[PDB]
Amino acid sequence: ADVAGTSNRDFRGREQRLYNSEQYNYNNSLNGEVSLWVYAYYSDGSVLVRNCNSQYKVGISECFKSLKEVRVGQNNDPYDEQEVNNGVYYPNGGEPTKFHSNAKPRAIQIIFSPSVNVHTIKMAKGNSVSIPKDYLQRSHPWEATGVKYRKIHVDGEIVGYSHYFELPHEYNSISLSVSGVHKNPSSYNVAAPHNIMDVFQSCDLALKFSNRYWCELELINHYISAYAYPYLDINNHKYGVPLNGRQ
């Protein structure tokens, strides 16, 4: 046989490149996943991830309470934190023993898989009682924030998209929903009658994941890197696996 890495008959090499290219392109096909991660960062350095993976479109919807840090199996002062909730839903509305709950997120990162179309991204960043813009009567139920999403590049490939905002002020008390639609450069509408019921089933079939990792390092190591997910850390370092046309 020919010698490795010297000719056009390195079929092992060609197969490796095709395998990676096939995965990249499968993900972008209408058969493929689109994925959404919402990261809530807490002052103790831990990070809650909410993830949903689904065909056609994907979303996550959280309220003020559900974004709060919960240390499973440890003390969370649940009565005091209910009083925090009461005091955040209406000023002077509760009697907790604290001015600022350390269970409040300090920041949010939203990451989409590379198979999203950024023009379809919508976000409802609402107030603490789940209204998009102060009062329902004046609220558009979402903002289209795609122009703010940064490309996560690795080796010149877009491995995902990130929108990051800090919540450093005392009044940054939010509710949050996010939605994105899978790429569809074809004119075949996946939700027109020929395929519409499959999109309804995709709502059933969407797989969700949630966990609180003790720090960003642990998240990078045992979540992001373990499962070939895109990520952008606090030092603006990019994580992901470039696949298209690559060995």
Ligand SMILES: Nc1nc2c(ncn2[C@@H]2O[C@H](COP(=O)(O)OP(=O)(O)OP(=O)(O)O)[C@@H](O)[C@H]2O)c(=O)[nH]1
């Ligand atoms: N493209 C390129 N890569 C370099 C160069 N010097 C060092 N590198 C390293 O080599 C890596 C790319 O090597 P290859 O993947 O084998 O070459 P390629 O440019 O991708 O071309 P292909 O054979 O089509 O894959 C990069 O990740 C760089 O870190 C250079 O001058 N050009």
Ligand SMILES: Nc1ncnc2c1ncn2[C@@H]1O[C@H](COP(=O)(O)OP(=O)(O)OP(=O)(O)O)[C@@H](O)[C@H]1O
């Ligand atoms: N020293 C080099 N000279 C020429 N081309 C390179 C070199 N290093 C990488 N490249 C090529 O340039 C393209 C972009 O790769 P690069 O490593 O810059 O991507 P990146 O990870 O987005 O970069 P960075 O995160 O450092 O800004 C890739 O196709 C890669 O093969």
Ligand SMILES: [Cl-]
């Ligand atoms: Cl397709």
Ligand SMILES: [Mg+2]
């Ligand atoms: Mg009292």
Ligand SMILES: [Mg+2]
């Ligand atoms: Mg290469």
